[PDB]
């Protein structure tokens, strides 16, 4: 349930790549190949899945989203049955790369949240801007909009949300298009506020949502705005005043404090956001209220020790030694992760791997 009131109007990071399967690879058994690109900016990226030096035809990808630091992440995936002679990889091109990078498939009780992410990217002399919006409950996405898609409607992405009727879907579509109209204006406004020509591409990112505790009582609320991956204006933790990033944003901070915009947002974040998060948790409780404990395992002058965690939900986890690769989506709703540490051969028993996850009775300690 997005903001019902039309919103008030107004750095380059390279991607990290991971190529893996959904399930452990078994020759002759259907599986899924994944290429997870994360932590990059801007959003233009070319991703290919390769089979024996050839492009895989039917490849699908997830809807664009971004993290706290504003960097984007995506999951490219396709179905395949690995056999003996086949070799797979993923190729990624991005403005930060001299030439495309190839990565080969190396075969060998908690809080809750509702979040909405918005991304608008200008296309000089190529039509309207690209507008993408996705909704999340905890780590499960449940709605999406892509201005380039056919429907021009808010679309479901989880089973429980398909319950809702036409009144709900009509409203959400009316609201998302309003978010779109606002972003379209801001792009031109911010182009002027930064003295940029009408020839370059620019990005505006918006994120807002609310947190509740295990008692489903309001905990924290967010509302943030970013231009080209840099902070522009955000609502402070108390939801009563704004944080302006630079000199250009102070004009907007004063226009919004003059129009008391933070009061309407606080009411949404404290009330409506919470109320509909509660309804979602109940409607899809077979999904959103489950906890999948990680199936854990360990892999091994110097040698390498790697702790592995697979098929766990939610994504929040901690693997610590006594190299950490970003948590990645399995593609079926679960996640994976591993951590590594170097060790002189022989002294592999004086080290341990600790795993703090929300679904485990107590922490697990792993050693050779």
């Amino acid at each position, epitope marked *: 349930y997005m903001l019902d009131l039309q919103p008030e109007t107004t750095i380059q990071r390279t991607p990290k790549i991971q190529v893996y399967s959904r399930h452990p690879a078994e020759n002759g058994k259907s599986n899924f190949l994944n290429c997870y690109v994360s932590g990059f900016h801007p959003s233009d990226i070319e991703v290919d899945l390769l089979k024996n*030096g050839e*492009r895989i035809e039917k490849v699908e990808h997830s809807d664009l989203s971004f993290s706290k630091d504003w960097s984007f992440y995506l999951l490219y995936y396709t179905e395949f049955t690995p056999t003996e002679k086949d*070799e*797979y990889a993923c190729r990624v091109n*991005h*403005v930060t790369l001299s030439q495309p990078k190839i990565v080969k498939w190396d075969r060998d009780s908690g809080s809750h949240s509702m979040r909405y992410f918005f991304t608008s990217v200008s296309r000089p002399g190529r039509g309207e801007p690209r507008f993408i919006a996705v909704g999340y409950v905890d780590d499960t996405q449940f709605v999406r909009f892509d201005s380039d898609a056919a429907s021009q409607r808010m679309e479901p992405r989880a089973p429980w949300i398909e319950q809702e009727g036409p009144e709900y879907w009509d409203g959400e579509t009316r609201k998302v298009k309003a978010h779109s109209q606002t972003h379209r204006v801001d792009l031109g406004t911010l182009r002027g506020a930064y003295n940029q020509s009408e020839a370059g591409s620019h990005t505006v990112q918006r994120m807002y949502g609310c947190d509740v505790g295990s008692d489903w009582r309001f905990l924290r609320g967010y509302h943030q705005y970013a231009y080209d991956g840099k902070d522009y204006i955000a609502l402070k933790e108390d939801l009563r005043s704004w944080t302006a990033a630079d000199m250009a944003a102070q004009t907007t901070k004063h226009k919004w404090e003059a129009a008391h915009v933070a009061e309407q947002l606080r009411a949404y974040l404290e009330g409506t956001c919470v109320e509909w998060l509660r309804r979602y948790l109940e409607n899809g409780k077979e999904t959103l209220q489950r906890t999948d404990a990680p199936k854990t395992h360990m892999t091994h002058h110097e040698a390498t020790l790697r702790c592995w965690a697979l098929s766990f939900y939610p994504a929040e986890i901690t693997l610590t030694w006594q190299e950490l690769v970003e948590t990645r989506p399995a593609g079926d709703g679960t996640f994976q992760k591993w951590a590594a540490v170097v060790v002189p051969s022989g002294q592999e028993q004086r080290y341990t791997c600790h795993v703090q996850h929300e679904g485990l009775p107590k922490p697990l300690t792993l050693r050779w």
Partner: nanobody
Amino acid sequence: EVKLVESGGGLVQPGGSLRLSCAASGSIFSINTMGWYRQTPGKQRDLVADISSGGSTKYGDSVKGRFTISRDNTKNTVYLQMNSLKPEDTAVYYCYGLSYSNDDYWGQGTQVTVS
């Protein structure tokens, strides 16, 4: 391991055409996909066209309809027929090839200029 010999670049008037060709050395069973990326004014190089040994093609949006890639059935040689060239097609065009183990090989490149 593999050597990629390029030729066919140079200068052309706006609206003109050029034929690039790239020939792969080594074993004929050591190369599958071959094509061309091109240098951008910035740091990255963008896809222009490539083709699998079976003839599957993919083009970059900015050359769709104007550029055509083809391959010799016998030898590992590809051809890029560039038509209706514009100044914004000025760049160094790098031939490339993929081993059947997904190893990439890159040529020196050929400067293409449109007045």
